[PDB]
Every structure is written in C-alpha cells, then in structure tokens.
Design an enzyme around this catalytic site. Sequence first.
Site, mmCIF file in Angstrom:
data_model
loop_
_atom_site.group_PDB
_atom_site.id
_atom_site.type_symbol
_atom_site.label_atom_id
_atom_site.label_comp_id
_atom_site.label_asym_id
_atom_site.label_seq_id
_atom_site.Cartn_x
_atom_site.Cartn_y
_atom_site.Cartn_z
ATOM 1 N N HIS B 41 32.692 3.963 69.267
ATOM 2 C CA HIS B 41 33.471 4.537 68.169
ATOM 3 C C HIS B 41 34.925 4.413 68.458
ATOM 4 O O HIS B 41 35.742 4.749 67.626
ATOM 5 C CB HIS B 41 33.132 6.001 67.965
ATOM 6 C CG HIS B 41 33.709 6.885 69.011
ATOM 7 N ND1 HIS B 41 32.981 7.308 70.091
ATOM 8 C CD2 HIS B 41 34.952 7.408 69.157
ATOM 9 C CE1 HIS B 41 33.744 8.075 70.853
ATOM 10 N NE2 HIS B 41 34.948 8.147 70.309
ATOM 11 N N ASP B 90 26.447 5.461 70.605
ATOM 12 C CA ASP B 90 27.853 5.387 70.955
ATOM 13 C C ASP B 90 28.024 4.671 72.274
ATOM 14 O O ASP B 90 28.037 5.283 73.328
ATOM 15 C CB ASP B 90 28.371 6.812 71.078
ATOM 16 C CG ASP B 90 29.861 6.909 71.005
ATOM 17 O OD1 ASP B 90 30.507 5.978 70.517
ATOM 18 O OD2 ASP B 90 30.387 7.945 71.435
ATOM 19 N N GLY B 190 41.185 11.806 74.950
ATOM 20 C CA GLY B 190 41.539 10.561 75.674
ATOM 21 C C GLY B 190 40.350 9.756 76.246
ATOM 22 O O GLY B 190 40.454 8.544 76.379
ATOM 23 N N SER B 192 36.834 9.117 75.777
ATOM 24 C CA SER B 192 35.750 8.322 75.216
ATOM 25 C C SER B 192 35.673 6.935 75.847
ATOM 26 O O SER B 192 36.675 6.228 75.951
ATOM 27 C CB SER B 192 35.905 8.200 73.699
ATOM 28 O OG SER B 192 35.404 9.350 73.040
ATOM 29 N N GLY B 193 34.470 6.557 76.263
ATOM 30 C CA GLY B 193 34.217 5.253 76.854
ATOM 31 C C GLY B 193 34.161 5.259 78.362
ATOM 32 O O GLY B 193 33.712 4.298 78.950
#
Lengths: 96, 254, 154
Positions: B41, B90, B190, B192-193
């Site tokens: 996302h 995700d 900050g 995500s991932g």
Amino acid sequence: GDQCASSPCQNGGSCKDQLQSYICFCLPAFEGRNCETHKDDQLICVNENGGCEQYCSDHTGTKRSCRCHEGYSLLADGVSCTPTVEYPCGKIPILE
Amino acid sequence: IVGGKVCPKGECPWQVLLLVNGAQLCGGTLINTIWVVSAAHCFDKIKNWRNLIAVLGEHDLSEHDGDEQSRRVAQVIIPSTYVPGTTNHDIALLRLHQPVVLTDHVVPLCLPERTFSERTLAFVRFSLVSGWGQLLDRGATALELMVLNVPRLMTQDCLQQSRKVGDSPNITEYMFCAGYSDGSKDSCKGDSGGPHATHYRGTWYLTGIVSWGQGCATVGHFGVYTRVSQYIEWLQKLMRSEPRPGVLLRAPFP
Amino acid sequence: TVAAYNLTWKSTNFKTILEWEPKPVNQVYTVQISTKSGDWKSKCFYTTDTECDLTDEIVKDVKQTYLARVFSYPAGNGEPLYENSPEFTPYLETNLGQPTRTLVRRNNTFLSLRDVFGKDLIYTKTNTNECFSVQAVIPSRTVNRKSTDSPVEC
Ligand SMILES: *[C@@H]1O[C@H](CO)[C@@H](O)[C@H](O)[C@H]1O
Ligand SMILES: *[C@@H]1O[C@@H](C)[C@@H](O)[C@@H](O)[C@@H]1O
Ligand SMILES: [Ca+2]
Ligand SMILES: [Ca+2]
Ligand SMILES: [Cl-]
C-alpha cells in the site's frame, strides 16, 4: 488412607501419599502423573525444532533430519549450520 | 516507531529506505542483493514509477557517511488479490535495477521456509520492528533508524484483547498482531514495509511486515503485520521466474 | 472441533498437572507453556488426554508466572483452535503437601521445602522444624495459605 498401595506409579519412581491423593517423583528421563512418558522418543520437529539449528524435516518411522538455509551447510553433529559465505543472511557482522 | 531505542549503526542491516523523488516513502527489507520486500500500500498513490529509489546501509537521514548504497527500483510486484486502499495482502516484492554489495552494513534478512516459520518462529515471543517512521501518531518522523522489540500474539488473543471499533479492518489469515495495548509502544506511519524480524538460535529471520493499526500505540490496540509465512512460495516462485516487462506488475496469488 | 474449556492447574508440592475438558471425540490436543515474556514450549503432542504433566517445565524457575494454552486438531490432520489456562505462579499458588522433599530438582535432586521457602516457611507456632497435628504455613501468600493438618500422633 494411603493411595500408593495401589502401585499407580510406573517406570520405577517412588510414590508419596497425600490426603485423598498422592504424588509421584519420577527419575529424570520420565514425566507424567505416573511417570509414564519417555522424553527420548519425541525427537520430532514440533518438539523444539528437532534440536536442529535452523530447519527440520520429520520422516516416517525414522529419525528427523536437519537442514540449512541457502548460504549455510550442515556440520558433522547433524544439527548445526555454518556459513559457507562472507555475508550469510540473518547475521550481523558488527556483532559477529 | 513509537517507544523504541535508536538502532546502533549497522545492527539493522536488512533495513531499506524507499524514496520517491527523493521524498521518504516507506521502509523495506533486503531478503536478497537484488530483492527487497515492502508493503503493497506504499504504492497506493504512486505517479512517478521511474523515480523509485531504494537505499540500503542508511542510518542517519541528515548526514551522509560512506555506507549508504542507492539503487533504482526496476519493478514493484503486488499480489493479484491486493486491493488499493485496503489492508489485506499488504506486501510488495521489489527488484532493484542492479545488486547492492553486501558489506558489514548491508546484509539480507533470511526469508525462512514456510513450515519452519509456522511451527517454530511463530512461537518466539519477541521480535524487532524498525524504521524512520513517526515517533508518535501524527508527530515527527525519525532521523536515525529506530528499533522496537515486540511480543507477538495469536489472532484469538488479539481479538479478545482488542477494543471493537465500528468498521475497522478484519484481522485475516494473512495478518498477525504484535506489540502492546498499554498505549506505550508500536510501529507507526513512517514504518510500513519494514522488517518484523525473529531471532532463532543465532539467525535472524523475516516473519512480518509493518502494515497497519488504529493510529499508533493507541490504548487497546496492537500493531498488525503482514504474515510473511503465507507468501513464501509466492515470493520464491517470483525470484526464480524470468523478468516480465512492466514496471508495476500484479502477480497472481497464490 | 471444539476448543478446550475450564482448564485448571492441579498443583501440590510443585507437581503440576494441567487439566481440561472435554474428552476428544475424533480430535486431539496439544499443549503449550510459557513464562510471561518467554518463548512458547510445546508438550503432550496430539494426545487424546485431558491432562498434561508440566512439573519439569514449571520447576525450572518456580518464581515465574506461567501461562498455558491447549490446541484442538481434527484427527488425521492459519492458526489452530485453542483456549487459555489461567495464570500460574508456582511459588505462590502450589498447594502444600500434608506434612510427614518437593518436586523441584536442581541437579538431579528434589530440594526440600526449606531449600525452596527458606525464611518464608513457618509451622503451627514455630519458624524452626519443631496429641499433635502440625500445619505448614507461608505468611506472605494471598492464596492457598496453608496445608492440611498432618496425621495426628500422641
Ligand atoms: C491406585 O492405582 C491406580 C492405578 O494405578 C490409581 O489410578 C489410583 O489413583 C491409585 O490409588
Ligand atoms: C524415590 O525417589 C525416586 C527418585 C526414585 O529414585 C525411587 O527409586 C525412590 O524410591
Ligand atoms: Ca491418602
Ligand atoms: Ca546518511
Ligand atoms: Cl541502479
């Protein structure tokens, strides 16, 4: 009345009478209410990764075996992985 | 990352910072010299696909020392089942234009065997999430890489302990929750991932990806993670199959 | 498959058996145990019992708070169904043995009550080890404060 007279315990552990109850002290290699479990047998993967360092394959009627992730090879004790490269995944050099 | 310590330089070497037009975007994880796992996302609003940049070896955003390695992102790959603006599936796989160079400050995170992950790893209680995200919901972001240590929960314990909120997302088979409810510590926007990393017997493995929550360290909520166990076959199939042409690519899942 | 219910710690003098319901019709149970911040160890794999002995696990560090949970699996075969034991802190909650060495074995030997409770251990009214009917007591405890009276002697 003593419950131990009924010889409930197994695998040679001593009994101790309690009230309306008893207890069973087992030797080290055995557990259970009546010491009826052999700890040795469960050399299987769901049991603490088979004792393997990284990976575990169960088999049928035969001892599990261990494996290493890419960039690692298996030692002579058959449980340990060692790196076969400079920078193997999942290790931090400034602490290694 | 709300509640954590600063990650002493070189001690989170699988951390990746993604950039667009030199603007901060998400974190990622190096699972390979050529390959970085992120959160799908992160790409929801992306208009400039040529200018995606991946940076390994980074620690401090303000000042540049000699360890940071930049590479252009060649391809961003998303599961077919991912729907933009929702939190299911995700995850993102990224091929870099050219390899990074493993050094003391750039190392890949082991991407574990799926059954190893399900039976052994899922039951290591604490793992590390990390990133340059916000230090408080709606607050500043980070200049040095942050790192936080978190307890994992099984989904039933998660539902029981979480406070029901109208029209919140469903915790799925492709998620897990980790962290705390006393509103003290969580990952945040900050982040995500980035990695949820599990130490087991001297080796760090990739078990999760910073994904979503109800704000950050909200009292009564946990942080949700992409359950990295579910995509192990899919990722592997992709890293071995031969390059497709397009820059964004929705791969069939499973 | 139904999830285990009404789980309880049966603990006397440190021998701890976890018990649950129901008896498995076409399903098996696995148990897991942990300290509050520790990793989850698995035991009693795919048993058809309603009990698991966890003396050896809890005994390694009796002052910890433990948590247990039990897993259901359809026989012959995305998390499995499970349900949680209440919190068990051995040092405080283990029932006391009706008085004449405990289950905790450091180095191949069952330690005695005093090897385990030291100063926390009195009797009924003596800090020492001395018709008579003695009860053992721990002052500190919230719960399970005292054993039943020894067998009477005159
Ligand atoms: C006598 O022995 C039986 C079986 O060994 C046991 O179940 C009883 O509790 C004991 O008194
Ligand atoms: C009771 O103690 C246990 C450890 C066993 O050694 C038995 O033989 C003994 O009687
Ligand atoms: Ca009796
Ligand atoms: Ca820098
Ligand atoms: Cl490049």
